[PDB]
Design an enzyme around this catalytic site. Structure first.
Site, short mmCIF file in Angstrom:
data_model
loop_
_atom_site.label_atom_id
_atom_site.label_comp_id
_atom_site.label_asym_id
_atom_site.label_seq_id
_atom_site.Cartn_x
_atom_site.Cartn_y
_atom_site.Cartn_z
N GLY A 22 0.80 -1.23 0.00
CA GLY A 22 0.00 0.00 0.00
C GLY A 22 0.83 1.27 0.00
O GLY A 22 2.01 1.26 0.33
N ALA A 23 0.20 2.38 -0.38
CA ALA A 23 0.84 3.68 -0.34
C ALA A 23 -0.18 4.78 -0.07
O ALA A 23 -1.33 4.70 -0.52
CB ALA A 23 1.59 3.96 -1.64
N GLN A 25 -0.70 9.08 1.99
CA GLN A 25 -0.19 10.40 2.34
C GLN A 25 1.00 10.33 3.28
O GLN A 25 1.90 11.17 3.22
CB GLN A 25 -1.30 11.23 2.99
CG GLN A 25 -1.00 12.72 3.06
CD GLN A 25 -2.01 13.48 3.89
OE1 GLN A 25 -3.17 13.09 4.00
NE2 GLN A 25 -1.56 14.59 4.48
N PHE A 26 1.02 9.33 4.15
CA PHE A 26 1.96 9.31 5.26
C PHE A 26 3.08 8.26 5.11
O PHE A 26 4.02 8.22 5.92
CB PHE A 26 1.21 9.13 6.59
CG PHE A 26 0.22 10.24 6.89
CD1 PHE A 26 0.65 11.54 7.07
CD2 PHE A 26 -1.13 9.96 7.02
CE1 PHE A 26 -0.24 12.55 7.36
CE2 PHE A 26 -2.03 10.96 7.30
CZ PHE A 26 -1.59 12.26 7.47
N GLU A 28 4.41 4.18 3.09
CA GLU A 28 4.16 2.96 2.32
C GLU A 28 4.20 1.71 3.21
O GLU A 28 4.79 1.72 4.28
CB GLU A 28 5.15 2.83 1.17
CG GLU A 28 5.10 4.00 0.17
CD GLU A 28 6.04 3.81 -1.02
OE1 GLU A 28 7.12 3.19 -0.84
OE2 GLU A 28 5.71 4.30 -2.13
N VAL A 29 3.55 0.65 2.73
CA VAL A 29 3.59 -0.65 3.39
C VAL A 29 4.12 -1.71 2.43
O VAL A 29 3.58 -1.89 1.34
CB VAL A 29 2.19 -1.07 3.89
CG1 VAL A 29 2.29 -2.32 4.75
CG2 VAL A 29 1.54 0.07 4.67
N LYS A 43 6.51 -0.85 7.45
CA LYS A 43 5.92 0.48 7.31
C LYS A 43 7.03 1.51 7.22
O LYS A 43 7.87 1.59 8.11
CB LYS A 43 5.04 0.82 8.52
CG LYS A 43 3.58 0.47 8.37
CD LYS A 43 2.74 1.30 9.34
CE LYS A 43 1.42 0.62 9.68
NZ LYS A 43 0.56 0.46 8.48
N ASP A 134 -9.67 2.77 16.96
CA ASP A 134 -10.03 2.55 15.56
C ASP A 134 -10.26 1.09 15.21
O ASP A 134 -9.72 0.60 14.21
CB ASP A 134 -9.03 3.18 14.60
CG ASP A 134 -9.67 3.55 13.27
OD1 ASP A 134 -10.91 3.65 13.19
OD2 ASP A 134 -8.93 3.77 12.30
C1 LIG Z 1 -3.45 -3.95 2.53
O1 LIG Z 1 -2.90 -4.97 1.71
C2 LIG Z 1 -2.18 -5.99 2.27
C3 LIG Z 1 -1.51 -5.79 3.47
C4 LIG Z 1 -0.78 -6.83 4.04
N1 LIG Z 1 -0.10 -6.70 5.20
C5 LIG Z 1 -0.26 -5.72 6.11
N2 LIG Z 1 -0.93 -4.55 5.96
N3 LIG Z 1 -0.74 -3.92 7.22
C6 LIG Z 1 -1.25 -2.72 7.54
N4 LIG Z 1 -2.00 -2.02 6.67
C7 LIG Z 1 -3.02 -1.10 7.13
C8 LIG Z 1 -4.34 -1.79 7.48
C9 LIG Z 1 -4.89 -2.60 6.31
C10 LIG Z 1 -4.19 -2.70 8.70
N5 LIG Z 1 -5.33 -0.75 7.80
C11 LIG Z 1 -0.99 -2.21 8.82
C12 LIG Z 1 -0.22 -2.94 9.74
C13 LIG Z 1 0.05 -2.38 11.09
C14 LIG Z 1 1.53 -2.04 11.23
C15 LIG Z 1 0.98 -3.31 11.87
N6 LIG Z 1 0.28 -4.14 9.38
C16 LIG Z 1 -0.01 -4.57 8.13
C17 LIG Z 1 0.37 -5.81 7.45
C18 LIG Z 1 1.18 -6.90 8.05
N7 LIG Z 1 1.67 -6.76 9.29
O2 LIG Z 1 1.36 -7.91 7.39
C19 LIG Z 1 -0.72 -8.06 3.40
C20 LIG Z 1 -1.38 -8.27 2.20
O3 LIG Z 1 -1.29 -9.51 1.60
C21 LIG Z 1 -2.22 -9.90 0.60
C22 LIG Z 1 -2.11 -7.23 1.63
#
Ligand SMILES: COc1cc(Nc2nn3c(NCC(C)(C)N)cc(C4CC4)nc3c2C(N)=O)cc(OC)c1
Length: 271
Positions: A22-23, A25-26, A28-29, A43, A134
């Site tokens: 993801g990407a 304003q603040f 990327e992930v 992050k 949240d």
């Molecule tokens: C969004 O798309 C994907 C994300 C992810 N992984 C992640 N997104 N994601 C966040 N993203 C923000 C959120 C979706 C949680 N709102 C926030 C946080 C907080 C820092 C621990 N962790 C994560 C992970 C993680 N710890 O694996 C995996 C995917 O595999 C298919 C697809």
């Protein structure tokens, strides 16, 4: 502790960002690897979007909330670009996963299983004297074994008197947020309980927007008449009545996450 004594600081070369998930304003992930073999989420902060101290405060909150049911903090890199590194969840966010072919094939029984898991994690937060602020399906992540974990701790706060008060101009998602936090900026663990009730709907509807057909002002107005969300399609009446407990008028009349956790395991072992 200073970065040189910090058990959480890691050298940047140990990390390899492989796939940007993801990407915004603040920042990327990314999906990435630590020391070659270990899948991790990374992050990274967009320089200038917010102060590094503001960013890093997420990793300090996570340090305090360690539990199998919450996404585990791994490490930080505290020289720009700032990184927060964590446990990697292969099935992404709950609200997205429920829309995939796998997600769609899940029984109500497994759905209730996941509800209980999320409640189990909020039971740990609650006893640690934290609030999340949240809680919602977009902030629940799913593992490769269809496990659920709570994530996105940026708004989480330590409560010493069960009540954090936000700024007077602060804005929160109206459909997910308890009246009292909307109206007065007052957040309790019982505000999270109200949000959990909303979360239960997203689960049963596979990621649908709560209060179908309604604008924010309509939700407020309906809620003030004593209405609650209309029963979702394909929602067991038992669960709906557990949702209603979550949405009680007085914060203190709403149940603890321990109670919700015990009930949902009963629902699940009954199906
Ligand atoms: C969004 O798309 C994907 C994300 C992810 N992984 C992640 N997104 N994601 C966040 N993203 C923000 C959120 C979706 C949680 N709102 C926030 C946080 C907080 C820092 C621990 N962790 C994560 C992970 C993680 N710890 O694996 C995996 C995917 O595999 C298919 C697809």
């Amino acid at each position: 502790k200073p970065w040189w004594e910090d058990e959480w600081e890691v050298p940047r070369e140990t990390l390899k960002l492989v796939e940007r998930l993801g990407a915004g304003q603040f920042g990327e992930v990314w999906m990435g690897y630590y020391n070659g073999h270990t899948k991790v989420a990374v992050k990274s902060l967009k320089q200038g979007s917010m102060s590094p101290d503001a960013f890093l405060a997420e990793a300090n909150l996570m340090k305090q909330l360690q539990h199998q049911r919450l996404v585990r903090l791994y490490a930080v890199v505290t020289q720009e670009p700032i990184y927060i590194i964590t446990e990697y969840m292969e099935n992404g966010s709950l609200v997205d996963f429920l829309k995939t072919p796998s997600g769609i094939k899940l029984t109500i029984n497994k759905l209730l299983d996941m509800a209980a898991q999320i409640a189990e994690g909020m039971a740990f937060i609650e006893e640690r004297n934290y609030i999340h602020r949240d809680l919602r399906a977009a902030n629940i992540l799913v593992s490769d074994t269809l496990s659920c974990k709570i994530a996105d701790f940026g708004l989480a706060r330590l409560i010493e008197d069960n009540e954090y008060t936000a700024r007077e101009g602060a804005k929160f998602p109206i459909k997910w947020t308890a009246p009292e936090a909307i109206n007065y900026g007052t957040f309790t663990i019982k505000s999270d309980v109200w949000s959990f009730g909303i979360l239960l709907t997203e689960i049963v509807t596979h990621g649908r927007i709560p209060y179908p057909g309604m604008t924010n002002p309509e939700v407020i107005q309906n809620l003030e008449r004593g209405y609650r969300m209309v029963r979702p399609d394909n929602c067991p009446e038992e669960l709906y009545q557990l949702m209603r407990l979550c949405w009680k008028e007085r914060p203190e009349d709403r149940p603890t996450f321990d109670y919700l956790r015990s009930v949902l395991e009963d629902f699940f072992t009954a199906t």
